[PDB]
Amino acid sequence: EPFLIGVSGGTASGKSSVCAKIVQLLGQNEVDYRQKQVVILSQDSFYRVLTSEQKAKALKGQFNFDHPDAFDNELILKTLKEITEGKTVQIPVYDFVSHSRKEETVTVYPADVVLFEGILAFYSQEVRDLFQMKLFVDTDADTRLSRRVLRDISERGRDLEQILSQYITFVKPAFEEFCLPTKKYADVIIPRGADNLVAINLIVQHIQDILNG
Amino acid sequence: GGEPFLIGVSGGTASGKSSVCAKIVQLLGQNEVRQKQVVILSQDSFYRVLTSEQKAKALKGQFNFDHPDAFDNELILKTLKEITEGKTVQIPVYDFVSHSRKEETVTVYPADVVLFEGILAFYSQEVRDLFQMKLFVDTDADTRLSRRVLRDISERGRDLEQILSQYITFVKPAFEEFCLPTKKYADVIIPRGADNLVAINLIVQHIQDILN
Amino acid sequence: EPFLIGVSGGTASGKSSVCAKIVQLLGQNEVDYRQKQVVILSQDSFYRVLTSEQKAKALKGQFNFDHPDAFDNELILKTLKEITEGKTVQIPVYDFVSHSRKEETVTVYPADVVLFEGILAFYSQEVRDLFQMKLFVDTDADTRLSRRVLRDISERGRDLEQILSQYITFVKPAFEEFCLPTKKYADVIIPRGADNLVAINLIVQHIQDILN
Amino acid sequence: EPFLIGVSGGTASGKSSVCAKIVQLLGQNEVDYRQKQVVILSQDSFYRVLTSEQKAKALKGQFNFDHPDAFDNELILKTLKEITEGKTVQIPVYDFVSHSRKEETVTVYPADVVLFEGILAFYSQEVRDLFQMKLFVDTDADTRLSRRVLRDISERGRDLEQILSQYITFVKPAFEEFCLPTKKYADVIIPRGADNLVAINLIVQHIQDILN
Numbered sequence: 001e002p003f004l005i006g007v008s009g010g011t012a013s014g015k016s017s018v019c020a021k022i023v024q025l026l027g028q029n030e031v032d033y034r035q036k037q038v039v040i041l042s043q044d045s046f047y048r049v050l051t052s053e054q055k056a057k058a059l060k061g062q063f064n065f066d067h068p069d070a071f072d073n074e075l076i077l078k079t080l081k082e083i084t085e086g087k088t089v090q091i092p093v094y095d096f097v098s099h100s101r102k103e104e105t106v107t108v109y110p111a112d113v114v115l116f117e118g119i120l121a122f123y124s125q126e127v128r129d130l131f132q133m134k135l136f137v138d139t140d141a142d143t144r145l146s147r148r149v150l151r152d153i154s155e156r157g158r159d160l161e162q163i164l165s166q167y168i169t170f171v172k173p174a175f176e177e178f179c180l181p182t183k184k185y186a187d188v189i190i191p192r193g194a195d196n197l198v199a200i201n202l203i204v205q206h207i208q209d210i211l212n213g
Numbered sequence: 214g215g216e217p218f219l220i221g222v223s224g225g226t227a228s229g230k231s232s233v234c235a236k237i238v239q240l241l242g243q244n245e246v247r248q249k250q251v252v253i254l255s256q257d258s259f260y261r262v263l264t265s266e267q268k269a270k271a272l273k274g275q276f277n278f279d280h281p282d283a284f285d286n287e288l289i290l291k292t293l294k295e296i297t298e299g300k301t302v303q304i305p306v307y308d309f310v311s312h313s314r315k316e317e318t319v320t321v322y323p324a325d326v327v328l329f330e331g332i333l334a335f336y337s338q339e340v341r342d343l344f345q346m347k348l349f350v351d352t353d354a355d356t357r358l359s360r361r362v363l364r365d366i367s368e369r370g371r372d373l374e375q376i377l378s379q380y381i382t383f384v385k386p387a388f389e390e391f392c393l394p395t396k397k398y399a400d401v402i403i404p405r406g407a408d409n410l411v412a413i414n415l416i417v418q419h420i421q422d423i424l425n
Numbered sequence: 426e427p428f429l430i431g432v433s434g435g436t437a438s439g440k441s442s443v444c445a446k447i448v449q450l451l452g453q454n455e456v457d458y459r460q461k462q463v464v465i466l467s468q469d470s471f472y473r474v475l476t477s478e479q480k481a482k483a484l485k486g487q488f489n490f491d492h493p494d495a496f497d498n499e500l501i502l503k504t505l506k507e508i509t510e511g512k513t514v515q516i517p518v519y520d521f522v523s524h525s526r527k528e529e530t531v532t533v534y535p536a537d538v539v540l541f542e543g544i545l546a547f548y549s550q551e552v553r554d555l556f557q558m559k560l561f562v563d564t565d566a567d568t569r570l571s572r573r574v575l576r577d578i579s580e581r582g583r584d585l586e587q588i589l590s591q592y593i594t595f596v597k598p599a600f601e602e603f604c605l606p607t608k609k610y611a612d613v614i615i616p617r618g619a620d621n622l623v624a625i626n627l628i629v630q631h632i633q634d635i636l637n
Numbered sequence: 638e639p640f641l642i643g644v645s646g647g648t649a650s651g652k653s654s655v656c657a658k659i660v661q662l663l664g665q666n667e668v669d670y671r672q673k674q675v676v677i678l679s680q681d682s683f684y685r686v687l688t689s690e691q692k693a694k695a696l697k698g699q700f701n702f703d704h705p706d707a708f709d710n711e712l713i714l715k716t717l718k719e720i721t722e723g724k725t726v727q728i729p730v731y732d733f734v735s736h737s738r739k740e741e742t743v744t745v746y747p748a749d750v751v752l753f754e755g756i757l758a759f760y761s762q763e764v765r766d767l768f769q770m771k772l773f774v775d776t777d778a779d780t781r782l783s784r785r786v787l788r789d790i791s792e793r794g795r796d797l798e799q800i801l802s803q804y805i806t807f808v809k810p811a812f813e814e815f816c817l818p819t820k821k822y823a824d825v826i827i828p829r830g831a832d833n834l835v836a837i838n839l840i841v842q843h844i845q846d847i848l849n
């Protein structure tokens with residue numbers, strides 16, 4: 001049975017780079033995709049195929065993609081279950097023009113350890129109860145917001161007003177209502193994110209031992 | 214201005230604390246006045262005159278204007294004591310170009326209500342014991358950072374990376390160490406800032422009652 | 426139209442005693458029952474009449490009376506709407522033996538000012554939209570727990586193990602899940618409770634100005 | 638050189654039970670004192686010898702043993718730098734009558750891993766910089782007071798009003814002003830405490846890895 005690590009934290013907490021760094025340090029980027037012992041899954045792969053009335057809100061730009069409802073809880077639960085039972089799985093690739101899933105999927109061969117990472121990884125009891133270990137990457141919201149702003153201006157061509165409109169109207173309230181109340185389910189809290197080498201090495205070491213048990 | 218009623222106002226940068234003070238005095242028409250019964254004092258007037266070592270620091274972005282050390286606590290305590298005793302006082306006018314006070318001082322005559330506003334208004338016990346009412350304008354750090362970034366870009370012409378580098382290195386550590394722990398000393402907390410018209414009307418109504 | 430003030434806070438915040446002290450400082454204990462210009466309603470008077478399955482849970486000490494499910498929001502809504510229409514209204518008296526309402530109701534005549542006070546006074550949009558002013562009495566959970574333990578040994582006949590088991594299992598999670606998030610709806614936050622005479626005198630003076 | 642783990646968190650966070658459990662799961666409770674590879678040091682062992690002035694405050698129940706000033710940072714620093722140099726060390730044992738150190742000491746032979754555990758283990762930069770790993774046991778203040786009351790009420794036998802007056806007056810203010818600001822120096826935060834078996838087993842394993 002594969003070892004499931006759930007990782008949560010708000011946007012730009014560093015939950016993504018933490019998963020990236022752990023997997024890099026375990027030599028997994030030098031390993032072919034068919035033979036990887038440690039795989040990373042993101043909750044944002046499992047965005048819902050939107051209905052007519054949902055797609056209408058999304059064109060008007062008034063659909064909160066950080067709300068639990070924007071996420072396909074039942075496909076997440078189904079898929080993680082299959083992973084647990086040792087089965088290989090298909091991860092969707094999301095089209096934001098059509099708010100539907102493309103035909104091309106991503107294949108995920110049975111792994112020894114699976115990192116499942118997202119803003120609402122711990123929101124559903126049934127999904128929480130599949131994780132052997134729960135990690136929350138705790139970064140102050142002001143810190144996270146500065147990171148969000150530099151990232152979205154630099155590697156995307158997004159405008160500063162639009163970024164802070166979306167943050168204040170949608171991201172912040174959804175973080176406070178749905179994500180932050182899930183911090184209390186975490187086994188281990190990792191402050192600051194990917195620059196926290198002591199916490200990362202501690203989780204790398206732990207996965208390393210698992211790969212040799 | 215027999216025995217002024219001193220109101221202390223704190224809260225982080227971009228909390229709303231200046232606008233709240235400004236709206237309170239506006240809604241009282243004590244705006245456009247010569248017999249001002251309500252005046253606003255700002256802790257921003259009481260910056261220390263800098264050494265040339267410190268002036269040199271300020272030219273680079275590396276002098277912490279959010280630290281207690283950057284404000285003249287002795288002159289603030291003295292100025293507020295004289296106000297409490299019903300005396301006319303001189304407020305400095307600070308020139309940032311020279312990092313020193315001009316000859317021009319602003320004359321504040323005994324008012325019936327004095328609103329003293331600053332990030333560190335409640336930091337010193339001697340100063341905080343002169344306030345008969347202490348207000349804290351409580352606004353979330355991410356909200357406050359959003360307002361600060363937009364003001365610094367759009368009014369003040371700042372570089373984005375410099376704003377946020379300075380935020381992380383100096384402003385945030387200074388707010389968490391020195392300002393945020395003073396919130397417990399507040400009698401009343403005003404969430405959000407200048408848009409809190411219910412909070413603001415409660416403070417204008419209360420100021421009119423003691424003007425009578 | 427009566428002026429409606431909603432008042433929330435965790436258990437042992439001091440919301441009850443803040444209300445009680447505001448009324449008494451107004452002189453409204455020396456005013457006659459039918460002539461009360463300012464009255465206090467408690468969300469407590471409006472516990473639901475429990476189902477059979479809820480009765481069962483309650484008798485085994487497994488029903489959370491701090492959950493929104495415990496409160497009769499429809500009756501709360503109805504009674505506040507009628508008070509805004511200037512009606513005389515009847516308030517239920519709850520009985521914890523039967524988990525139901527006594528025949529005895531309590532009569533409240535039209536007041537100028539109504540204080541409504543409860544852990545979940547701001548939980549429901551339609552109820553919170555009836556308040557002209559929302560006060561949240563903000564007292565640290567460790568402080569409030571200190572008060573609860575001393576209150577429950579003296580008043581009730583309870584031991585530490587029962588008070589703390591109940592607090593950890595029921596009061597705390599319900600407070601964090603349901604009460605704490607409503608704080609963002611307050612217009613004014615009152616730290617500490619009824620020893621905050623500056624905050625209390627402020628609400629008193631505001632209420633006096635309504636009565637004039 | 639030996640591996641120094643610093644552990645902090647508020648009174649009754651569980652940091653002491655976390656250290657006990659880690660050592661119990663590594664089989665060190667069986668190993669002979671002279672051959673122990675993992676040892677727990679407590680900051681509580683390094684209380685300062687009080688001056689007459691402080692001894693005077695302490696007799697009147699006014700010396701705050703949770704204030705940084707109550708810890709002998711110089712002795713802590715010396716003792717940990719010695720452990721780091723491979724040297725055998727004596728740990729004081731304290732008398733809370735004379736507010737000074739007994740005849741008897743406790744000998745600690747060079748260990749491969751030291752857990753240094755206390756409320757202010759990260760307060761001093763010099764102490765904090767010795768630790769290759771910093772753990773902070775984060776337990777809610779209302780939860781910690783719960784445990785503290787039950788623990789203290791017997792283990793010492795003392796009165797309930799005294800435990801709670803002491804907590805509100807001394808412990809809570811000292812935790813909020815001095816301990817809580819040290820959380821940002823933790824590499825890893827362990828929630829709830831000794832019942833967190835995932836977090837405990839993660840640390841046990843890391844230490845086993847180090848001993849092999």
Ligand SMILES: O=C(CSc1nc2c(cnn2-c2ccc(F)cc2)c(=O)[nH]1)Nc1ccc(Br)cc1
Nearest residue numbers: 140141142143176352353354355356389393820
């Ligand atoms: O001041 C701080 C940073 S804690 C903090 N609180 C925030 C931020 C943004 N919004 N809020 C906030 C939101 C809703 C509220 F209702 C209250 C605050 C933020 O960046 N940091 N110190 C701190 C750091 C870690 C811990 Br754990 C606790 C306090």
Ligand SMILES: O=C(CSc1nc2c(cnn2-c2ccc(F)cc2)c(=O)[nH]1)Nc1ccc(Br)cc1
Nearest residue numbers: 394397564565566567568601777778779813814
């Ligand atoms: O006590 C407080 C704020 S109010 C508060 N919140 C608490 C306490 C204990 N647990 N929580 C809590 C835990 C999880 C939640 F989701 C919500 C609440 C507490 O004593 N006070 N902090 C404080 C006060 C003064 C200073 Br100075 C610094 C920090």
